[PDB]
C-alpha cells in the first residue's frame, strides 16, 4: 500500500526486536551464558526488504533459544512473539534465496544487526 504502511510495519518489527534485546540485556542470571553462546546465521548484505528471508529462516531457532532460557524473571512468550515477528516479516518480504555470511554471531549481535536493518530502511523512507 502507501509508503507509510511499510514504515509502520518496520517500526513494529523494530520494536519487537528491541523488546527481545532490552529484555536480554537487563536479564541477570548465573546460567544466562547458555543463551548467549548460541550462534546465529547472519545475512551477507541487508539492503532491502527482500533480504528479510535471512531473518525469517532464523526465526525458529530464535524462538527455540528464547524458549530454552525461560526463568521467572525472563518471560517473553517466544512462540507468540516470534509469530508476531513472523507475520510482519511476511508482509514485508512479500521466492528469494537467502545468502548467509561466513561468520556467525551471538543473539545480541544478531538482534542488533536486524535492529539496524529496520532503522536503516525507515530513515530512507522518511
Amino acid at each position: 500500500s502507501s509508503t507509510k504502511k511499510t514504515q509502520l510495519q518496520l517500526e513494529h518489527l523494530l520494536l519487537d526486536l528491541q523488546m527481545i534485546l532490552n529484555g536480554i540485556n537487563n536479564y541477570k542470571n548465573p546460567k544466562l551464558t547458555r543463551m548467549l553462546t548460541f550462534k546465529f546465521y547472519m545475512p551477507k548484505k541487508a539492503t532491502e526488504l527482500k533480504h528479510l528471508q535471512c531473518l525469517e529462516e532464523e526465526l525458529k531457532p530464535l524462538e527455540e533459544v528464547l524458549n530454552l532460557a525461560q526463568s521467572k524473571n525472563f518471560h517473553l512468550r517466544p512462540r507468540d512473539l516470534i509469530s508476531n515477528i513472523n507475520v510482519i516479516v511476511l508482509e514485508l518480504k512479500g521466492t528469494f534465496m537467502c545468502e548467509y555470511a561466513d561468520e556467525t554471531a551471538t543473539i545480541v549481535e544478531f538482534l542488533n544487526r536486524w535492529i539496524t536493518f529496520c532503522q536503516s530502511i525507515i530513515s530512507t523512507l522518511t
Partner: antibody
Amino acid sequence: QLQLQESGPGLVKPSQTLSLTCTVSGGSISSGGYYWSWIRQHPGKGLEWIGYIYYSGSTYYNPSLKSRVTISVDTSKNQFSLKLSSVTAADTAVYYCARTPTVTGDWFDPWGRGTLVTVSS
Amino acid sequence: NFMLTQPHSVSESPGKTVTISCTRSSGSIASNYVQWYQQRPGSSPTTVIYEDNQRPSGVPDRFSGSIDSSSNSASLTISGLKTEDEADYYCQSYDSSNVVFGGGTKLTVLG
C-alpha cells in the same frame, strides 16, 4: 496518578461484535516496559484473561478466546481497544483493562474501574 | 497451559490465621511468579501479594505468600484475621501459553 477507564456499550445483542476501549490518563503508552491487557469476569464467576498488546502492536491472546478476540493499540491517543465477535449470554461480564510489566512476569497493576456488559436480545 | 485450583471458600473467626491454597495442574509452580488479588464486591481487584511473596506498600503485614514445590501449590496466609479481609481472593500465575487465574476463594470472617 495512572488511571485506566474502560468504555463500552453496556448493552449488546447476541451474535454482534463487542467493541471496548481503554483510556490511559495520568500516564501514557510510551514505553516498552508494559503489556496492555483486557480481563473479564462473568457475574458470580472468576477472572478470565482475554489478552494483551505490546505498544509495538503485537498481540497475545487466551487460547480459548483467540479465535474471537482482536486487540489494537493507539499510542497517539493513549488508548487500546478490544473486539469480541459473535457474543452470547456467556459473554455477559464486567470487562477490565489493566497494565502488566513485560519480561518480569504477568502481574496486573493497576486495574481499570471495569465496565459491565450485558448481552441480551 | 494449566489450571489453578482454589478452595471455593475458607473461613475463620477474627484474630485467627487462615490459608488459601492455589494448586497448579500442569508444570512447576516455582517456574512462574504467583500473584494474589483481593476483590471486594462490585469493585476492581487489587494486589495483596505479587511475585510469590512480595508485598505492595499499603498492604498490611498480615498478608504473606509462599510456594510449595512438593504439592505444586501456592498459598496465601493471613494472620490476625480482620473483617476488612473478608473478600474474594484470586491466585494468578502465567505460562508460555497464557495467563491463568484461579477459580477464586471467598474468605469469610465469622461474625
